[PDB]
Amino acid sequence: TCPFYKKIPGTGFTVDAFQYGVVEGCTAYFLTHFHSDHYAGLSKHFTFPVYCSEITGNLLKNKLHVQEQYIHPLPLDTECIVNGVKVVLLDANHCPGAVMILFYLPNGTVILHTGDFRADPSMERSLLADQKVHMLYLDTTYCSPEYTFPSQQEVIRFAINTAFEAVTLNPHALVVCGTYSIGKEKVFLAIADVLGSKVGMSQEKYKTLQCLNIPEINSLITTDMCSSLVHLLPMMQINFKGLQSHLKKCGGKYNQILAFRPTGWTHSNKFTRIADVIPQTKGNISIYGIPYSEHSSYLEMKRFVQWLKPQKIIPTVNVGTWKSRSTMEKYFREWKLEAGY
């Protein structure tokens, strides 16, 4: 059964609610983005209208085989009427195709559902500038002040400089980058661009990337692993055993691996600067964990909410424990008392 924080009151709509069977009263199912915890339940046998971005709808059709007649892609930044209700899709600054959804309820209430997002000051000049928001369904993944991490631009500068130094010192080094979902494509694309290579990957991952509307993508990726010196592997293989095994398969072309594991936050963030990050090394294999986040830091989240000034907040992450719920409610009240709304 579908939980309350996935239902939009005063509508027939649900958000990210495909794992509960037929939800009573739902006339349109929205999908914020193509991550498995959110799409869980969708397949070629789905027969209700799904509303989403163009990119999400390319993934639903090619990867999950949902039939075309049930996929309703909406353009971004554009007022659309769905089943008698005005909606807008906004870029969420999460993975490719990820959106926030503005709902203009028939009674005058305005609701923002963030989906998953990484808050940014540029959202203060989107279509959100133009009217009041009563209710905020908020991605609270990192809603605690210990969650600090650098900008995505600082993390990519670190990765590119690290990879270019290593391969210039040793032209026989291979670079490997872990992946298990869409998102974080800048890591492997930025490193392949500085090295003058395409990114090599499996047929299944090439297929996924071909759905993402990235400009000039045919110039950037390949399934011919032998022609490439940046390889993508599943995240589970980014360990010393997995990497040793991969290096064997390369037929003596390479004699060293430098590997990247983009994580979210880890507790090594509480003490060390991005500048000072060091790898784990065994022999001719070195592994860097890099804190590339596609979710808001605590500070980015707090700035967004203090600007928006919602009347009510409904968290969508960390909702399962009383301690997490009480912690998040305390910070929301701090924010509100500090800013005066």
Angle between helices 54-63 and 203-210 (to 10 degrees): 150
Of 35 and 118, the one with the shorter C-beta distance to Ni ion is: 35
Min dist. Cβ of residue 78 to Ni ion (A): 23
Contact range with Ni ion by CB under 5 A, out of 35-43, 200-208, 227-235, 313-321: 35-43
At which residue do the structure tokens 């400009």 appear?
A: 215
Min dist. Cβ of residue 303 to Ni ion (A): 21
- Separation between Cα atoms, residue 175 and residue 169, nearest integer Å: 13
Contact (Cβ atoms closer than 8 angstroms) between residue 306 and residue 335 = yes
Of 35 and 231, the one with the shorter C-beta distance to Ni ion is: 35
How big is the site for Ni ion, counted in residues (CB under 5 A)?
2
Min dist. Cβ of residue 117 to Ni ion (A): 9
Is 35 among the residues that bind Ni ion (CB under 5 A)? yes
Angle between helices 185-195 and 152-169 (to 10 degrees): 40
Q: In angstroms, how far is CA 50 from the centroid of its own chain?
A: 20
Of 36 and 218, the one with the shorter C-beta distance to Ni ion is: 36
Of 116 and 300, the one with the shorter C-beta distance to Ni ion is: 116
Min dist. Cβ of residue 72 to Ni ion (A): 21
Min dist. Cβ of residue 94 to Ni ion (A): 6
- Separation between Cα atoms, residue 233 and residue 291, nearest integer Å: 18
Min dist. Cβ of residue 286 to Ni ion (A): 29
Contact set for Ni ion, span 48-77 (CB under 5 A): none
Of 35 and 205, the one with the shorter C-beta distance to Ni ion is: 35
Q: Which of 29, 46, 116, 211 binds Ni ion (CB under 5 A)?
A: 116
Q: Locate the DSSP E strands across the chain.
A: 7-8, 13-15, 28-30, 50-52, 71-73, 80-82, 85-91, 99-104, 110-113, 135-138, 173-179, 199-200, 221-222, 230-234, 256-263, 280-282, 285-291, 312-315
Of 184 and 261, the one with the shorter C-beta distance to Ni ion is: 184
Contact range with Ni ion by CB under 5 A, out of 19-27, 64-72, 113-121, 245-253: 113-121
Locate 340 and state its tokens: 């005066």
The footprint of Ni ion (CB under 5 A) covers: 35, 116
